[PDB]
Design an enzyme around this catalytic site. Structure first.
Site, PDB file in Angstrom:
ATOM      1  N   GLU A   1       1.632  -0.476  -4.892  1.00 10.44           N
ATOM      2  CA  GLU A   1       0.634   0.503  -5.288  1.00 10.44           C
ATOM      3  C   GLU A   1       1.316   1.842  -5.503  1.00 10.44           C
ATOM      4  O   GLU A   1       1.626   2.555  -4.555  1.00 10.44           O
ATOM      5  CB  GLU A   1      -0.467   0.686  -4.244  1.00 10.44           C
ATOM      6  CG  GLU A   1      -1.535   1.662  -4.754  1.00 10.44           C
ATOM      7  CD  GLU A   1      -2.159   2.551  -3.693  1.00 10.44           C
ATOM      8  OE1 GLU A   1      -1.621   2.721  -2.590  1.00 10.44           O
ATOM      9  OE2 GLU A   1      -3.244   3.102  -3.969  1.00 10.44           O
TER      10      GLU A   1
ATOM     11  N   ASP B   1       0.830  -1.193   0.000  1.00 15.58           N
ATOM     12  CA  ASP B   1       0.000   0.000   0.000  1.00 15.58           C
ATOM     13  C   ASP B   1       0.871   1.251   0.000  1.00 15.58           C
ATOM     14  O   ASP B   1       1.906   1.302   0.674  1.00 15.58           O
ATOM     15  CB  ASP B   1      -0.879  -0.040   1.253  1.00 15.58           C
ATOM     16  CG  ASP B   1      -1.752   1.179   1.412  1.00 15.58           C
ATOM     17  OD1 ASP B   1      -2.697   1.297   0.601  1.00 15.58           O
ATOM     18  OD2 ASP B   1      -1.505   1.976   2.344  1.00 15.58           O
TER      19      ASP B   1
END
Ligand SMILES: [Ca+2]
Ligand SMILES: [Cl-]
Length: 496
Positions: free
Chosen positions: A233, A197
Site C-alpha cells: 500500500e 499496510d
C-alpha cells in the site's frame, strides 16, 4: 512476489472487510469457489487495541498490540479453519499485514486489546511480542513533534510516526525477525500473500529485508518454491518525492491513481469523458500493469477522506459504481481487487462524514454474522457488492477473457465507448445523457450471447438482454441513458 498464486483462470481478489473468519470460510465454500473468485483479502488478523471512544471503529484494527491471531474476526483456530477450508476449495487468503507501527503513542496503557494482552504505549512496552523502547524510531525521527509533518521530506515519512502511531525500527534485525515470525506463522498456516499496510512509511530496503526472511508457500497446497504475493500500500498520486516505483523490487503496489481517475472520468469532472479511456493504463501515468493492484475504492477511501478524496466511487453510488467496476474488470490493466463493504449511517456535515469511524455491524461490539437472503444478497447491513449480479458476472468475464488483448475500441467522442478482449469478450458503455444505438464490431464468433449485466445465462437461455453477433463479428447494441445499468457485457461463456 508479483504473481497472485490464485488458481489458473481465477483473476480477482475480494476484500471481505471486517468479516469474521467463520463467515469467510462459509463464503469460500458456498460462493467464492463456484463463482470463480481468486481469493480474499482479510482484515488484519493480529491483536489490536480495543478502542471505546469512539465505539469500536474500523480503524482500531490498524493499531497493533501483538501478533497473536486474536481479533473481533476470530481466534487462531478459527483463522486456521478458514484458511484450510478456503484453500481446500481453491480460494486463497491474503493477509493485511500491519507491520510499520504499533498503536497510537497516546493510547492508555492496560489490557484494552482484542486478546487482553497488556501494552503500554507511553513506555513503548508491548510484552506480548515482545517489543520495548529499543524497537521504535523515537531516536531516529528528526521532527519536532515526533510525527510525520511534511511529505516533501521522504526521510521523516519513513522514520516518524504516522499520525502518532508508534513507528517500528525496521532497520533492526530483531524487529525484522519478529515481523517475519508473524508472517511465516501465517504462510505456514496457508496464506498466499500479503497486503503490506502503510508501505510508503517503510523504506523499500527494510521491506526487502523482511521479505528475504519469508518462507515459500505451504507445500501441501502450493507448488514447491511458490513465493507469497506481495502488494504494497503506497499512496502515490504524484507531487511528492516518494514514488511507488521505488517499491517494485519487493512486489506489486496499490495504484491509487486508478480509482481516483476512473472516478473523475465516470463522474465527468473537469470535462473528463469515457472516450479518453482508450489509452487507459501507463498512458495515464500509472505504474506498469504487472506491478499494479487496482481497485475502484478501498476500505479507507470509500469514506471520502482517502487517496482520491471525493472522486472515489462506492456502493453508495451504485449505478456509476457498477459501471466503474465493470470497466476495471473488463480492461486488461492490473490485478483486480473488488471491494465488499458494510453499510454505516453516513452523515455529511460541511462536506465530510462525521460517522466515517463507525465499525462493522455489531451487537454490543460483537461483529454480526453475514446472513444470505434468498435472492443471494446479504443481510445484517453487509453490502456484499461481490454478490451483485453485475459485479459477480464481471469477475467471471475477467476469468473468461484472461490473456486476451485489448482490441476493437470504439468511442463517440463523448461517453459512449466499447472494447473487446480478443475473441472472448466485448463490453459497451453509455455514460452520455442520450441513448446509444449502434452496430459495432465485437471480434466474437457469430451467435446469440446473453448480456451478463442485465441477466444471466441459465439453462440454455438468457434472463436479460440478448445480443446477436453476425458472421462478420458485428452486433447491434442499444443502451438508453435511462437503463438500470447503462452497459452491456458478453463473453464466450455467455454464448447460447
Ligand atoms: Ca515507518
Ligand atoms: Cl489498499
Amino acid at each position: 512476489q508479483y504473481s497472485p498464486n490464485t488458481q489458473q483462470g481465477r483473476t480477482s481478489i475480494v476484500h471481505l472487510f471486517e468479516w469474521r473468519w467463520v463467515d469467510i470460510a462459509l463464503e469460500c465454500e458456498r460462493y467464492l469457489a463456484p463463482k470463480g473468485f481468486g481469493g480474499v483479502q482479510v482484515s488484519p488478523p493480529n491483536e489490536n487495541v480495543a478502542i471505546y471512544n469512539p465505539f469500536r471503529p474500523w480503524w482500531e484494527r490498524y493499531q497493533p498490540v501483538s501478533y497473536k491471531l486474536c481479533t473481533r474476526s476470530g481466534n487462531e483456530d478459527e483463522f486456521r479453519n478458514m484458511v484450510t477450508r478456503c484453500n481446500n476449495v481453491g480460494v486463497r487468503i491474503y493477509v493485511d499485514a500491519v507491520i510499520n507501527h504499533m498503536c497510537g503513542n497516546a493510547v492508555s496503557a492496560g489490557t484494552s486489546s482484542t486478546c487482553g494482552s497488556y501494552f503500554n504505549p507511553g513506555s513503548r512496552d508491548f510484552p506480548a511480542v515482545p517489543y520495548s523502547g529499543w524497537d521504535f524510531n523515537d531516536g531516529k525521527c528528526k521532527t519536532g513533534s515526533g510525527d510525520i509533518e511534511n511529505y516533501n521530506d521522504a526521510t521523516q515519512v519513513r522514520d516518524c510516526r504516522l499520525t502518532g502511531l508508534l513507528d517500528l525500527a525496521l532497520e533492526k534485525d530483531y524487529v525484522r525477525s519478529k515481523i517475519a515470525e508473524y508472517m511465516n506463522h501465517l504462510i505456514d498456516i496457508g496464506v498466499a500473500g500479503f497486503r503490506l499496510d502503510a508501505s510508503k512509511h517503510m523504506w523499500p530496503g527494510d521491506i526487502k529485508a523482511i521479505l528475504d526472511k519469508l518462507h515459500n508457500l505451504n507445500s501441501n497446497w502450493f507448488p514447491a518454491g511458490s513465493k507469497p504475493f506481495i502488494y504494497q500500500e503506497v499512496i502515490d498520486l504524484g507531487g511528492e518525492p516518494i514514488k511507488s516505483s521505488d517499491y517494485f523490487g519487493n512486489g506489486r503496489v496499490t495504484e491509487f491513481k486508478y480509482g481516483a481517475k476512473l472516478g473523475t472520468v465516470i463522474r465527468k469532472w473537469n470535462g473528463e469523458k469515457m472516450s479518453y479511456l482508450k489509452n487507459w493504463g501507463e498512458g495515464w501515468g500509472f505504474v506498469p500493469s504487472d506491478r499494479a493492484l487496482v481497485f475502484v475504492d478501498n476500505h479507507d477511501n470509500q469514506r471520502g477522506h482517502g487517496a482520491g478524496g471525493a472522486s472515489i466511487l462506492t456502493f453508495w453510488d451504485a449505478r456509476l459504481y457498477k459501471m466503474a467496476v465493470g470497466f476495471m474488470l473488463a480492461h486488461p490493466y492490473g490485478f483486480t481487487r473488488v471491494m465488499s463493504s458494510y453499510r454505516w449511517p453516513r452523515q455529511f456535515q460541511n462536506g465530510n462524514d462525521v460517522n466515517d469511524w463507525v465499525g462493522p455491524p455489531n451487537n454490543n461490539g460483537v461483529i454480526k454474522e453475514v446472513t444470505i437472503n434468498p435472492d443471494t444478497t446479504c443481510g445484517n447491513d453487509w453490502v456484499c457488492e461481490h454478490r451483485w449480479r453485475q459485479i459477480r458476472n464481471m469477475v467471471i468475464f475477467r476469468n473468461v477473457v484472461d490473456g486476451q488483448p485489448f482490441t476493437n475500441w470504439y468511442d463517440n467522442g463523448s461517453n459512449q465507448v466499447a472494447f473487446g478482449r480478443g475473441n472472448r469478450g466485448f463490453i459497451v458503455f453509455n455514460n452520455d445523457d442520450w441513448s446509444f444505438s449502434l452496430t459495432l464490431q465485437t471480434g466474437l464468433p457469430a451467435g446469440t450471447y446473453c448480456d451478463v449485466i442485465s441477466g444471466d445465462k441459465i439453462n440454455g437461455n438468457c434472463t436479460g438482454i440478448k445480443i446477436y453477433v453476425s458472421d462478420d463479428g458485428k452486433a447491434h447494441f442499444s443502451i438508453s441513458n435511462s437503463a438500470e445499468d447503462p452497459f452491456i457485457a458478453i463473453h464466450a461463456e455467455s454464448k447460447l
